[PDB]
Design a binder for this molecule. Structure first.
Ligand code: HEM
Length: 416
C-alpha cells in the first residue's frame, strides 16, 4: 500500500480509462496519501472531497489550471506580445473577489434562460447529424460532438454570426495544456493560438460595447461593469470570453462522448431510452456519475489544515479523484451498477460542489440530452464499432478521443 502511494502516477492509460478502479485501493483503505511523483496529496472518498470543495478559503482553486510541464519562457514572450493579461477567472479565482464576481455575473446562467438557447442547440445538433447520417460509419467526436459545445458557447456569449465563423480555428484542445504534461512544442503552439484568440476577442469585446443592450453573457457583463466598475475590470471581461469557452467546450464534449459510449455499451439501457426518450435526463445524469468526464480536480491549501487525520502544510497540492468519489460505495449504493433510475445520481461531483459549483451545468446537461435524444431518435440502430479507445493523459478530464459508430443507412428510421 505504501508502494502504491509512492508509485502513483496518473499519466497512464489505466488512470484515464478507469480512475475509480485505479485508486480503489486508496478509496477503501488509504483516504489520503502523498504522491511523490506529483508532489500532490491524493484523496479518493466522496465525503473527503466534499469537505475540501466546501471551504474555498482554506482550499484554494489556484492550481486548477496549472500544467505539469516545466515553465516555458517562449510561451510568456508570445503571450506578452499579444498583450495577454494572465487573469485568473472564476474557476481558479480566490475569495473574496471570486464570489463577488460570481454574484455579479451569474444571472444569464439561470435555468429560466435555458429555453432561450434550446432551439439553437436542437438546430445545431440536427444539422450535424444530417452531415453523416447517410454514411453508415462516423466518428461521433470529430463529426459532431467536438464542435457543438464550442458553437453553443459562442451563442451563450452572444458572438455575432460573422465572428463565430472567424473563430472556428480557435476551437483547439486545452486539456493537456491545463491539466497534463505538454511537450515544449505543444506549449508554444497553444500559446500562439491563445494569443491570437485574445487579440480577436479584444476586437469582439469593443464591438459588443457598441451594442451593449443586445443578447448574450458578454453584453450582460458589459452592462454590469457600468454598475460595478470596481468589481469587473476590462482585463477580466476580456479574459472571460476565453474562460467561458474553455469551461464550456471540452467538458461537454467529454461528458457527451462518455455518455454515448456508456449507453451503447449497456444495450438494454440504450433500448430503454430509444423506446422512452423521457428517460434521457435521468440517464445522462447517471452517465455523469458512472462514466463522467472529471477524473480529478485540484485544490491548494492556504493554511495548515487536517484532512483525514493528516495535517497538510501551507501551499499543499491536493488531487481530488472525483471519479473515485462518484464510485464511492460509502455514498453510492452498488456503485458499479449503471442504473439510470438511481435516485441520487445528481449528487455526483462532475460539476463540483460549493462556491465554485459549475455555473453552466444545466446548459451542459441540456447539450448532452439533446445530442443523446437526436442520436437515439434518428440512429437507434447504430452500434459501437470495434475500436481502440485512446485517452489524453492528464489529471482532470477523461474521454475517448474518438467514438466510432456504425449503422445501416437503409434502416434509418426517417427512411421508413
Ligand atoms: C458537462 C459539462 C461540464 C462539466 C462536467 C463542467 C465542470 C466544471 C467543474 C468541475 C467546475 C469547477 C467546480 C468547482 O470548483 O466547484 C466548473 C465550473 C464552471 N463552469 Fe463548468 N462544466 C461543464 C459545462 C459548463 C458550461 C457549458 C459552461 C458555460 C455555459 C460552464 C461554465 C463554468 C464556469 C463559469 C465555471 C466557474 C464557476 C466558478 O468558479 O464560480 N461549464 N465546471
Amino acid at each position: 500500500v505504501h508502494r502504491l502511494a509512492e508509485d502513483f502516477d496518473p499519466f497512464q492509460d489505466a488512470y484515464m480509462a478507469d480512475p475509480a478502479q485505479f485508486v480503489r485501493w486508496a478509496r477503501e483503505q488509504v483516504p489520503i496519501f502523498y504522491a511523490p511523483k506529483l508532489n500532490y496529496w491524493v484523496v479518493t472518498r466522496y465525503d473527503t472531497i466534499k469537505q475540501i470543495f466546501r471551504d474555498p478559503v482554506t482550499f484554494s482553486p489556484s492550481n486548477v489550471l496549472q500544467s505539469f510541464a516545466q515553465p516555458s519562457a517562449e510561451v510568456r514572450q508570445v503571450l506578452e506580445r499579444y498583450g495577454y493579461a494572465f487573469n485568473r477567472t472564476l474557476v481558479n479565482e480566490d475569495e473574496p473577489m471570486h464570489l463577488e464576481r460570481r454574484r455579479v455575473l451569474m444571472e444569464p446562467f439561470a435555468s429560466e434562460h435555458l429555453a432561450e438557447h434550446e432551439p439553437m442547440v436542437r438546430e445545431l445538433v440536427r444539422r450535424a447529424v444530417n452531415r453523416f447520417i447517410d454514411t453508415g460509419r462516423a466518428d461521433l467526436v470529430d463529426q459532431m460532438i467536438w464542435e457543438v459545445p464550442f458553437t453553443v458557447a459562442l451563442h451563450f456569449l452572444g458572438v455575432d454570426d460573422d465572428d463565430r465563423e472567424k473563430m472556428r480555428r480557435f476551437a483547439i484542445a486545452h486539456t493537456v495544456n491545463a491539466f497534463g504534461r505538454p511537450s515544449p512544442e505543444e506549449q508554444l503552439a497553444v500559446a500562439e493560438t491563445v494569443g491570437q484568440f485574445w487579440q480577436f476577442c479584444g476586437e469582439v469585446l469593443e464591438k459588443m460595447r457598441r451594442t451593449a443592450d443586445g443578447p448574450g453573457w458578454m453584453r450582460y457583463s458589459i452592462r454590469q461593469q457600468k454598475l460595478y466598475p470596481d468589481v469587473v475590470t476590462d482585463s477580466y471581461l476580456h479574459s472571460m470570453m476565453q474562460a467561458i469557452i474553455v469551461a464550456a467546450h471540452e467538458t461537454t464534449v467529454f461528458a457527451t462522448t462518455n455518455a454515448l459510449k456508456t449507453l451503447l455499451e449497456h444495450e438494454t439501457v440504450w433500448r430503454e431510452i430509444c423506446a422512452d426518450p423521457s428517460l434521457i435526463p435521468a440517464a445522462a445524469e447517471e452517465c455523469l456519475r458512472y462514466n463522467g468526464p472529471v477524473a480529478g480536480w485540484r485544490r491548494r491549501t492556504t493554511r495548515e489544515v487536517e484532512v483525514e487525520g493528516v495535517r497538510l502544510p501551507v501551499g499543499a497540492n491536493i488531487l481530488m479523484v472525483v471519479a473515485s468519489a462518484n464510485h464511492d460505495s460509502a455514498h453510492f449504493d452498488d456503485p458499479e451498477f449503471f442504473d439510470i433510475g438511481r435516485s441520487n445520481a445528481s449528487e455526483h461531483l462532475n460539476f463540483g460542489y460549493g462556491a465554485h459549483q459549475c455555473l453552466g451545468r444545466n446548459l451542459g446537461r441540456m447539450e448532452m440530452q439533446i445530442m443523446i435524444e437526436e442520436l437515439s431518435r434518428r440512429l437507434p440502430h447504430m452500434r459501437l464499432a470495434e475500436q481502440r479507445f485512446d485517452y489524453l493523459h492528464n489529471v482532470s478530464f477523461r474521454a475517448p478521443r474518438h467514438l466510432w459508430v456504425e449503422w445501416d443507412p437503409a434502416q434509418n428510421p426517417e427512411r421508413r
